TrEMBL record, chain A:
Official protein name in the record: Large ribosomal subunit protein uL2
Domain of life, per lineage: Bacteria
UniProt feature, compositional bias: Basic residues: 257-272
PROSITE patterns hit by this protein: RIBOSOMAL_L2
Domain Large ribosomal subunit protein uL2 C-terminal: 123-252
A Pfam family hit: Ribosomal_L2_N
Molecular function terms from GO: rRNA binding; structural constituent of ribosome; transferase activity
Large ribosomal subunit protein uL2 RNA-binding domain location: 41-117
Subunit record text: Part of the 50S ribosomal subunit. Forms a bridge to the 30S subunit in the 70S ribosome.
Coiled-coil boundaries: none
Automatic annotation (TrEMBL), chain B:
Pfam families: Ribosomal_L23
Keyword Membrane: no
Subunit structure and binding partners: Part of the 50S ribosomal subunit. Contacts protein L29, and trigger factor when it is bound to the ribosome.
Highest taxon in the source lineage: Bacteria
Protein name (database record): Large ribosomal subunit protein uL23
Gene name for this UniProt entry: rplW
PANTHER family the record matches: 60S RIBOSOMAL PROTEIN L23A (PTHR11620)
Key words, A-Z: Ribonucleoprotein, Ribosomal protein, RNA-binding, rRNA-binding
Classification via Gene3D superfamilies: 3.30.70.330
Database matches in InterPro entries: Nucleotide-bd_a/b_plait_sf, Ribosomal_uL23-like, Ribosomal_uL23/eL15/eS24_sf, Ribosomal_uL23_CS
GO cellular component, one term: ribonucleoprotein complex
From TrEMBL, chain C:
Pfam families according to UniProt: Ribosomal_L34 (PF00468)
Keywords: Ribonucleoprotein, Ribosomal protein
A single GO BP: translation
Ribosomal protein is among the record's keywords: yes
Any one GO cellular component localisation term in the record: ribosome
GO terms assigned for molecular function: structural constituent of ribosome
Keyword Ribosomal protein attributed: yes
Biased composition range(s): Basic residues: 1-19
InterPro entries, per the entry: Ribosomal_bL34, Ribosomal_bL34_CS
Official protein name in the record: Large ribosomal subunit protein bL34
Length: 272, 90, 44
RNA sequence: UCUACCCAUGUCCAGGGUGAAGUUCAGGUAACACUGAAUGGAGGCCCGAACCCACGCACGUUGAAAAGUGCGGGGAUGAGGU
RNA sequence: UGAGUAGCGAAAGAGGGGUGAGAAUCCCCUCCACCGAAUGCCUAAGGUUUCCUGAGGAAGGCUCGUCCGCUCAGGGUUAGUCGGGACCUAAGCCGAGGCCGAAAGGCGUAGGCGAUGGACAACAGGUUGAUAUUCCUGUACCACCUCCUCACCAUUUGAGCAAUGGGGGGACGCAGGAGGAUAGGGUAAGCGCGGUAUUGGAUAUCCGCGUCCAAGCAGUUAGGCUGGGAAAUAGGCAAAUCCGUUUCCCAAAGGCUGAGCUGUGAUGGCGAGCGCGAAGUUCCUGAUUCCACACUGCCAAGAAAAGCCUCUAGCGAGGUGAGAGGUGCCCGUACCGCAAACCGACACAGGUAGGCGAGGAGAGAAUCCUAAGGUGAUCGAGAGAACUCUCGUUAAGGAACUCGGCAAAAUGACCCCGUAACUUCGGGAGAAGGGGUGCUCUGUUAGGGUGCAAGCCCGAGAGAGCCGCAGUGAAUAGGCCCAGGCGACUGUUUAGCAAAAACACAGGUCUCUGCGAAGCCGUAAGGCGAAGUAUAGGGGCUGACGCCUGCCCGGUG
């Protein structure tokens, strides 16, 4: 699923890209595009709050249904499309009643297969169930915290979650990175592995490709000046003589946990 | 408003004398007056029929005398093309 | 050798025009003190 | 209104080379590789105008000019210039 | 004071006439010269009368000045179709309600503003001193209205009308390559007009000039784009004939769009040339333009909305269509705009967005000289010293000079031949480095394009000869090689002393964060992150690739 360019120029020396055999078409469907202008890392008052961002190729948003609301209608899918929003490629599925909708394409999905969405759906890849009907030990994705909100938790390419068990009002599912969490039983997740698994195997060769992607370059703090960063200054190349390394805003940035220790959510994380 | 005020004074140049031969007439009109009420004014008060009206306005020329640097009046000049076999004007 | 002043009437009246100064409170103080001073061209 | 960066929307890049990946054909093998022709046209590709930049030298230094000119230079389909 | 000194701001004029009180500087004429992908022609931003005419020369003009971008007195800009408004919306801005905040205020919904975008109907001739798709001329087109005209429908089993509601559209990137057409170009042929010269020669395959016409209307077309029909209907907040979706049947028809081209517009205009006015065709070449973002491929995956069409809800008793007659507002319109009117304090060797942008040779907008066209650029003449600067040559030696081949010199085009170590097999590599290039004839060469031909265009080569010291005879287009650091590379940076080994970079690694993520801005509402979800974000460090990355947790964190 990954092809490597033979090195003709010097930019393309280590230069692999993802071919699009999984992708079945090129034109996006008209009624579901959404306008989307890049903010360029600027706040509502215009100040820059996120570094290293802004200035990519222009993109058009595609509204995609994380909610999986419509229940019981047999949905067929005839496409697989590349979305230039998030790593995964997303698939338009068209319903029996005559309305078309967009879905994250899961692993091993193909054209023409059927999709069910109810709380009585059989568990096949791409289906949607509330967690109470999901059997234990099944790989699942697109989970949400609040019911009716729409899937939030596992959406990136090749990412997965397997249900460790139900125990009542709450269900134990193991998210990605393994830090298991204890969540409502009434939320609707989508069955399977997300269908762009090989995405880490991309090798950006050119810096211009990341510039197309929309990544501004990142400067080290050690080559800063004294005022604008705690590391900067010192002639020659100096090691960071500031005990633990700290961020541009003074917070140390090497392994101290940063979450509000008095939050509400921490009574669900602590299974681990 | 009153039609007897909408056009102020005619202007007598060599160009104007040329156009009265071929039956177009020159007038200086009010600044707020536009292409049409000058037309309705002129057939209301002249008994003439006018085919086409052209309008253009001049801004004041800068002009110097003594040590003061004043500005002359902004003007709006109107051209009225009478129809065939329409009456003439003084 | 592009010099420090390129003229643009639209940007000039947008950033220094009378409506632009009256839109703010601080601009109103600017108008008031200029008028107390007695400037002929009172706003840009 | 200079300049740095960013947002939306336009515009510009005379010309000549190189020849990728695929595709077809010929062999090749049970098949798969593979081998050769044609095709194909990719490149933060090459050479080089407009355009942009400013590497060297000379002059200029009460200058044509409060930062330039002349002779050469670099990029020149891109992280492009405007 | 310097001192009558420096300077008088890139440039080829010269001569005769004329004005004048005064003439290198003003005007007229003849030659010469300069630019000509511009120093030509339009037109932005901007300036605001600098534009034209007639007077004047105190100041401005680096001199003069009879002169003008100066002064004075007049005069000059005409639009239903061009540009912008009464059309739409992006970024952004404002913002009733509201939400926050010691006060001022900040944020923001509905909504509105906001072109650099989308849509949107006139053109080619003439005209003066100044304007011209605006004025005159002829042919048009768009929107709207009805004192009128004819044709048709139904005036509730209703003709007609259609929405601030759905649906389609508008609706889109980049690169490359055919093809089709037209600009444009050659004067090749033919045609017309004028001429045949005095310097040796030339009524002759001789010389100079010209050899065209829209928009609209009717057809046609290179083409591109499209399957069509029927039934049913968990949808598109309400409806469905519209759209969407399944099932059944036919597969090419048909439809959409379409550069251009034919007639007409044209019994008219333009047209070399002395108010009049001839010929006004064919051939070849032929795009940087159009078909057209049409196709193909590519991945970084490529605006909104209203114009426009459709559907019902709805309105509905008079309308629809064609004539005939009428209506059609505001603002801009001069002049300059690579310049002496703009920005640089100046009539400043600088900068200044877009459209067109010819010929010879040429791959070309390079290069040199010219066309159309514009200009001789505002101090001069006259000696031809030192010295400074920009250039051109130098015998012999050739890098000795010099910190350093700095500078300068040398190679340079096209076609053949040939081309190494290393290599990440792409490269290195135009490696190096050789050889040929002019003209004439064999030849309107093989051969090819174009056309039925006639003719026109392109020209691989060889073979005989002719000259020059020299044949890409000028202008302009790599010096090269061998090693070694440093940095993988293209890139970026101290405007105005430092472009580098500095920064970035792809890659790597560590670390935080389970989504009202973390982090950041703000007190806060609000945001960014992100209309994203550990294959994702944030931070630190190192810097392609290859081989590796040892020991110490006593101290600090």
């Amino acid at each position: 699923a990954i092809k490597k360019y033979k090195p003709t120029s010097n930019g393309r020396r280590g230069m692999t890209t993802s071919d699009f055999a999984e992708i079945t078409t090129d034109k996006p469907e008209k009624s579901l595009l959404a306008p989307l202008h890049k903010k360029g890392g600027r706040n509502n008052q215009g100040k820059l709050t996120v570094r290293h961002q802004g200035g990519g190729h222009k993109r058009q948003y595609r509204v995609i249904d994380f909610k999986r609301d419509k229940d019981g209608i047999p949905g067929r899918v005839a496409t697989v499309e590349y979305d230039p929003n998030r790593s995964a490629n997303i698939a338009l599925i068209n319903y029996a009643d005559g309305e078309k909708r967009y879905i994250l394409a899961p692993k091993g999905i193909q054209v023409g297969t059927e999709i069910m969405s109810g709380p009585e759906a059989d568990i096949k890849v791409g289906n949607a169930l509330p967690l109470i009907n999901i059997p234990v030990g099944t790989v699942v994705h697109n989970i949400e915290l609040k019911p009716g909100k729409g899937g939030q938790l596992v959406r990136s390419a090749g990412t997965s979650a397997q249900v460790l068990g139900k125990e009542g009002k709450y269900v134990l599912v193991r998210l990605n990175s393994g830090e298991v969490r204890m969540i409502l039983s009434a939320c609707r997740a989508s069955i399977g592995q997300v269908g762009n698994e090989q995405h880490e195997l991309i090798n950006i060769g050119k810096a211009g490709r990341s510039r197309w992607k929309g990544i501004r370059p990142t400067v080290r703090g050690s080559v800063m000046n004294p005022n604008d960063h705690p590391h900067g200054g010192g002639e020659g190349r100096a090691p960071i003589g500031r005990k633990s390394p700290m961020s541009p805003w003074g917070k140390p940035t090497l392994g101290f946990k940063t979450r509000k220790k008095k939050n509400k959510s921490d009574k669900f994380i602590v299974r681990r | 408003k009153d039609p007897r005020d909408v056009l102020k004074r005619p202007v007598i140049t060599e160009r104007s004398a040329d156009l009265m031969t071929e039956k177009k007439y020159t007038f200086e009109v009010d600044v707020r007056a536009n292409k049409t009420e000058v037309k309705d004014a002129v057939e209301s008060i002249f008994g003439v029929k006018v085919d086409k009206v052209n309008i253009m306005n001049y801004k004041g020329k800068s002009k110097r005398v003594g040590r003061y640097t004043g500005m002359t009046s902004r003007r709006r000049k109107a051209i009225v093309k009478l129809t065939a076999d329409s009456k003439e004007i003084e | 050798m592009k010099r420090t002043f390129q003229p643009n009437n639209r940007k000039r009246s947008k950033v220094h025009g009378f409506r632009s100064r009256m839109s703010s409170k601080n601009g109103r103080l600017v108008l008031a003190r200029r008028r107390r001073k007695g400037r002929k061209v009172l706003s840009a």
